[PDB]
Amino acid sequence: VNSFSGYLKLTDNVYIKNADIVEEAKKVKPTVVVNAANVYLKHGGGVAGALNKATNNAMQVESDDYIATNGPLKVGGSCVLSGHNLAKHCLHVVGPNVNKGEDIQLLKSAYENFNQHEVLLAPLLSAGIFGADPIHSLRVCVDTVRTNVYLAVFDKNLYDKLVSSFL
Ligand SMILES: OC[C@H](CC1CCCC1)Nc1ncnc2[nH]ccc12
């Protein structure tokens, strides 16, 4: 039993809700919140900009130190950093950004990072401003993640389409 509320169950391990991931994280304080990161951990917009804003820029400060030490992530890769006031940990995961020409096949590799954590609150990787088809992202999520994932979909209209089209 966990404290996630109001989710529709899609499969044995995947759940979905129309929600602002920032507000969800502040309520649940999950062990792991997933950020839709880029390789530079520059949290400018989308989920990343919103999460970072909610941390009063502490996420960005921590991220800049991480990059200065370690260099950029790989597309499809991840790192674990602090969750600040939102969660115990933040798993920064880089899905391919179609608006940069990156290979959509890397989306499966990106979701594989979720399997290192028993339970996660997460967005749909590569959706939104990353330019991929969210229906496809949900399909890859369900077919790749084996741990318990609670997906927050910000856009209500998109949420309804994802549910109604789910196979
Ligand atoms: O990339 C996933 C998603 C893409 C868009 C959301 C609506 C239409 C497409 N972004 C978000 N998902 C959940 N909570 C969020 N809070 C701020 C941003 C955000």
PDB file of N, CA and C and ligand atoms in Angstrom, residues 19-22 46-47 50 123-124 127-129 152-155 158, ligand 1:
ATOM      1  N   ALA A  19      -2.832  15.143 -13.655  1.00  0.00           N
ATOM      2  CA  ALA A  19      -2.327  15.861 -12.496  1.00  0.00           C
ATOM      3  C   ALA A  19      -1.096  16.662 -12.879  1.00  0.00           C
ATOM      4  N   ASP A  20      -0.879  17.738 -12.126  1.00  0.00           N
ATOM      5  CA  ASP A  20       0.353  18.513 -12.179  1.00  0.00           C
ATOM      6  C   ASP A  20       1.385  17.811 -11.305  1.00  0.00           C
ATOM      7  N   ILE A  21       2.459  17.317 -11.928  1.00  0.00           N
ATOM      8  CA  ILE A  21       3.447  16.511 -11.212  1.00  0.00           C
ATOM      9  C   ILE A  21       4.048  17.280 -10.045  1.00  0.00           C
ATOM     10  N   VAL A  22       4.156  18.607 -10.165  1.00  0.00           N
ATOM     11  CA  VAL A  22       4.661  19.415  -9.057  1.00  0.00           C
ATOM     12  C   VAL A  22       3.728  19.312  -7.860  1.00  0.00           C
ATOM     13  N   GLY A  46       8.857  22.987 -19.493  1.00  0.00           N
ATOM     14  CA  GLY A  46       8.196  21.712 -19.349  1.00  0.00           C
ATOM     15  C   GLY A  46       8.219  21.256 -17.904  1.00  0.00           C
ATOM     16  N   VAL A  47       8.242  19.935 -17.725  1.00  0.00           N
ATOM     17  CA  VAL A  47       8.313  19.367 -16.383  1.00  0.00           C
ATOM     18  C   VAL A  47       9.546  19.875 -15.644  1.00  0.00           C
ATOM     19  N   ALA A  50       9.299  23.384 -14.346  1.00  0.00           N
ATOM     20  CA  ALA A  50       8.309  23.449 -13.277  1.00  0.00           C
ATOM     21  C   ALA A  50       8.842  22.843 -11.980  1.00  0.00           C
ATOM     22  N   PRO A 123       6.489  11.661 -15.269  1.00  0.00           N
ATOM     23  CA  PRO A 123       5.797  12.106 -16.476  1.00  0.00           C
ATOM     24  C   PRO A 123       6.038  11.113 -17.609  1.00  0.00           C
ATOM     25  N   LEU A 124       5.276  11.288 -18.687  1.00  0.00           N
ATOM     26  CA  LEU A 124       5.542  10.551 -19.914  1.00  0.00           C
ATOM     27  C   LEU A 124       6.790  11.099 -20.596  1.00  0.00           C
ATOM     28  N   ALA A 127       7.372  13.297 -24.142  1.00  0.00           N
ATOM     29  CA  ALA A 127       6.122  13.962 -24.486  1.00  0.00           C
ATOM     30  C   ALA A 127       6.263  15.473 -24.282  1.00  0.00           C
ATOM     31  N   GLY A 128       5.159  16.193 -24.459  1.00  0.00           N
ATOM     32  CA  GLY A 128       5.196  17.636 -24.292  1.00  0.00           C
ATOM     33  C   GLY A 128       6.209  18.269 -25.225  1.00  0.00           C
ATOM     34  N   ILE A 129       7.010  19.192 -24.680  1.00  0.00           N
ATOM     35  CA  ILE A 129       7.959  19.951 -25.491  1.00  0.00           C
ATOM     36  C   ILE A 129       9.097  19.110 -26.051  1.00  0.00           C
ATOM     37  N   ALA A 152       1.812  11.042 -14.074  1.00  0.00           N
ATOM     38  CA  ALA A 152       1.056  12.283 -13.997  1.00  0.00           C
ATOM     39  C   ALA A 152       1.038  12.923 -15.378  1.00  0.00           C
ATOM     40  N   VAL A 153      -0.160  13.110 -15.923  1.00  0.00           N
ATOM     41  CA  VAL A 153      -0.373  13.746 -17.219  1.00  0.00           C
ATOM     42  C   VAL A 153      -0.985  15.115 -16.951  1.00  0.00           C
ATOM     43  N   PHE A 154      -0.251  16.185 -17.282  1.00  0.00           N
ATOM     44  CA  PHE A 154      -0.712  17.531 -16.935  1.00  0.00           C
ATOM     45  C   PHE A 154      -1.976  17.915 -17.699  1.00  0.00           C
ATOM     46  N   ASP A 155      -2.014  17.628 -18.995  1.00  0.00           N
ATOM     47  CA  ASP A 155      -3.075  18.118 -19.866  1.00  0.00           C
ATOM     48  C   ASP A 155      -4.291  17.202 -19.759  1.00  0.00           C
ATOM     49  N   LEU A 158      -5.309  15.655 -23.019  1.00  0.00           N
ATOM     50  CA  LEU A 158      -4.423  14.560 -23.399  1.00  0.00           C
ATOM     51  C   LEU A 158      -4.679  13.321 -22.547  1.00  0.00           C
TER      52      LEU A 158
HETATM   53  O1  LIG B   1       6.411  15.680 -20.836  1.00  0.00           O
HETATM   54  C1  LIG B   1       5.316  15.268 -20.061  1.00  0.00           C
HETATM   55  C2  LIG B   1       4.238  16.432 -20.038  1.00  0.00           C
HETATM   56  C3  LIG B   1       4.030  16.941 -21.537  1.00  0.00           C
HETATM   57  C4  LIG B   1       2.857  17.970 -21.754  1.00  0.00           C
HETATM   58  C5  LIG B   1       1.856  18.044 -20.567  1.00  0.00           C
HETATM   59  C6  LIG B   1       0.499  18.461 -21.157  1.00  0.00           C
HETATM   60  C7  LIG B   1       0.554  18.185 -22.668  1.00  0.00           C
HETATM   61  C8  LIG B   1       1.957  17.630 -22.973  1.00  0.00           C
HETATM   62  N1  LIG B   1       4.617  17.522 -19.073  1.00  0.00           N
HETATM   63  C9  LIG B   1       4.177  17.593 -17.728  1.00  0.00           C
HETATM   64  N2  LIG B   1       3.586  16.465 -17.189  1.00  0.00           N
HETATM   65  C10 LIG B   1       3.137  16.460 -15.880  1.00  0.00           C
HETATM   66  N3  LIG B   1       3.203  17.473 -15.002  1.00  0.00           N
HETATM   67  C11 LIG B   1       3.794  18.587 -15.537  1.00  0.00           C
HETATM   68  N4  LIG B   1       3.996  19.746 -14.859  1.00  0.00           N
HETATM   69  C12 LIG B   1       4.594  20.694 -15.638  1.00  0.00           C
HETATM   70  C13 LIG B   1       4.818  20.125 -16.881  1.00  0.00           C
HETATM   71  C14 LIG B   1       4.313  18.759 -16.877  1.00  0.00           C
END
